């Protein structure tokens, strides 16, 4: 109650965060400075004067997230137009880049230089953890700061402040799907660090959305800016539904304990229904069965474990928007009673679901628009040996032909660490295989 503090690291994690901020700002009708003319309109939070009045308020407005970026362009963008009093100039953060796609680079090389100033803001952010609940960290996981800086921070969060829940939203392709043969090499250690120190990760495949953005949504010019705008709509459809209005308004803790019922984090792939060309050009309101069916359209469901297979533990559908109770129970009962889909034989139950009842009130402009019926989906497969098995395979597919661990050690890390982490992924394969054939 309401939502809770949000940490935005990396350039994707800031543009996603700006997209989400515009969504909260747009439904609200917030004035750029002031002084605001409504009694009172909900949007971020349930006051809107003095602006933002985001649960945090006063002075020169105290912000409810932190953005950290390489270029002044975003600080110029907020200082000149709207959002200007909705942030504070000393917590709108701007630095520089020098870039490497290497684990050792964020862990050591820039990681020992820029740490103490950002640390001091992390220490203060952990002192003033508004909303009470935990840390929402927007990643930044695949690169050299993504791999390196996140691995150092994840431990430091976890050892000092492990009583708090850590929610990590991650943009990253499932292994071997990327054209890059050298892309697993920096990611092998973070993948290993995640084993110990990540209980909760919601993952988007950037390759899956690229294909959806080009073909389902029928966008002529995809670019990064437009993709990150679309993944802000995901983050908003989830979060902005559970903040405080017409919903179950499920807590961070309550969700985490449903996600993770036994040792090692239970990370699902995220998908989203109205990333469809009819919807973008405006079409029918839809019934809860039909929004389901739009969501279960080709390309929108994953092909990873093969579409109907991989032995689902559960799928969890998050029904935003006005809903009828008959319609929703049949919406999740129909797939099960069809029984096209494959589940674990010990547990064919699938009772996992979010039903909420506030509509999106956002104005036409972006790829989201004002609607009655929405859904988002988290898919959990047991037979994930295939992911680990690809990570294992793809590293050696360079490696056997010619050795290529040199650069990841030339930036300052131990040699044996890389391949031991690889060996771990290979033993993980058979652990997630056996649960993938269940009992």
């Amino acid at each position: 109650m309401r939502e809770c503090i949000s940490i935005h690291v990396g350039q994707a994690g800031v543009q996603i965060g700006n997209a989400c901020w515009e969504l909260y700002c747009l439904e609200h009708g917030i004035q750029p400075d002031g002084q605001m003319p409504s009694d009172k309109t909900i949007g971020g939070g349930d006051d809107s004067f003095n602006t933002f009045f985001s649960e945090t308020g006063a002075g020169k407005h105290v912000p409810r997230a932190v953005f950290v970026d390489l270029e002044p362009t975003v600080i110029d963008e907020v200082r000149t137009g709207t959002y200007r009093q909705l942030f504070h100039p000393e917590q709108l953060i701007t630095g520089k880049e020098d870039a490497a796609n290497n684990y050792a680079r964020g862990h050591y090389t820039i990681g020992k230089e820029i740490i103490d100033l950002v640390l001091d803001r992390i220490r203060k952010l952990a002192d003033q953890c508004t909303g009470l609940q935990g840390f929402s960290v927007f990643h930044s996981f695949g690169g050299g700061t993504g791999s390196g800086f996140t691995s150092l921070l994840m431990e430091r969060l976890s050892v000092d402040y492990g009583k708090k829940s850590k929610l990590e939203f991650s943009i990253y392709p499932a292994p071997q799907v990327s054209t890059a043969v050298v892309e697993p090499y920096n990611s092998i250690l973070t993948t290993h660090t995640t084993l110990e120190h990540s209980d909760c990760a919601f993952m988007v495949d950037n390759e899956a959305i690229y294909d959806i953005c080009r073909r389902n949504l029928d966008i002529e010019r995809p670019t990064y800016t437009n993709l990150n705008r679309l993944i802000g709509q995901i983050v908003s459809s989830i979060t902005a539904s559970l903040r405080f209005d017409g919903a179950l308004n499920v807590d961070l803790t309550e969700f985490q304990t449903n996600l993770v019922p036994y040792p090692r984090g239970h990370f699902p792939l995220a998908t989203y229904a109205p990333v469809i060309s009819a919807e973008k050009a405006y079409h029918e309101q839809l019934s809860v069965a039909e929004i389901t069916n739009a969501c279960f359209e080709p390309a929108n469901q994953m092909v990873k474990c093969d579409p109907r297979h991989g032995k689902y533990m559960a799928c969890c559908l998050l029904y935003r928007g006005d809903v009828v109770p008959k319609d929703v129970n049949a919406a999740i009962a129909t797939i099960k009673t069809k029984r096209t889909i494959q589940f674990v034989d010990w547990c064919p139950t699938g009772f996992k679901v979010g039903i909420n009842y506030e509509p999106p009130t956002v104005v036409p402009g972006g790829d989201l628009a004002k609607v009655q019926r929405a859904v988002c989906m988290l898919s959990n497969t047991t037979a994930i040996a295939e992911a680990w098995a690809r990570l294992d395979h793809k590293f050696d597919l360079m490696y056997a032909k010619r050795a290529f661990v040199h650069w990841y050690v030339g930036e300052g890390m131990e040699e044996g660490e890389f391949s031991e982490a690889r060996e771990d992924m290979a033993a993980l394969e058979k652990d997630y295989e056996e649960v993938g054939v269940d009992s």
Partner: protein, 164 residues
């Protein structure tokens, strides 16, 4: 007969040297046959793993330099006279208090073990392998030295008694 003592002592010095000498030959050959990328691998690092630092300070202190400083020790492998110094190394010239200080800092040390260093960096591997064999060879050569000099005194007496 006269040669009996000379022969004994000579074989005695050689039995000691042969235990360590195929290692020194294997180790010089290790350092010669490196590809030029594995000098850049050990050099590039801004913040080195600690075993890398310990092997690069070890060889630098053995070989010719007084520098503990990461900025100065990493470039010494790109000198044009590095292999000339190693091919024309004199392990005898290395002074006795200093030898035992080197074995104390590097040889005895936990993270200077050959398995812990090649785990850290195989590109440190060739360089640590010379540093170990050499520093051990100066130690065994100096240890056989009192009997090596008594040999060259006996050889000198043995020639002079022959010219008598």
């Amino acid at each position: 007969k006269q040669q009996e003592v000379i022969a004994d002592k000579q074989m005695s010095v050689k039995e000691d040297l042969d235990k360590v000498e195929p290692a020194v030959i294997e180790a010089q050959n290790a350092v010669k046959s490196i590809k030029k990328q594995h000098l850049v691998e050990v050099r590039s690092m801004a913040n080195p793993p600690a075993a890398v630092k310990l092997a690069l300070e070890s060889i630098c202190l053995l070989l010719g330099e007084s520098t503990t400083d990461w900025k100065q020790i990493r470039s010494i492998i790109m000198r044009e006279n590095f292999i000339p110094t190693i091919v024309n190394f004199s392990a005898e010239e290395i002074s006795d208090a200093i030898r035992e200080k080197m074995k104390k800092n590097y040889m005895s040390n936990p993270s200077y073990n050959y398995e812990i260093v090649n785990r850290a960096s195989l590109a440190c591997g060739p360089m640590v392998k010379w540093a170990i064999a050499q520093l051990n060879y100066a130690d065994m050569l100096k240890r056989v030295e009192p009997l090596r000099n008594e040999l060259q005194k006996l050889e000198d007496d043995a020639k002079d008694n022959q010219q008598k």
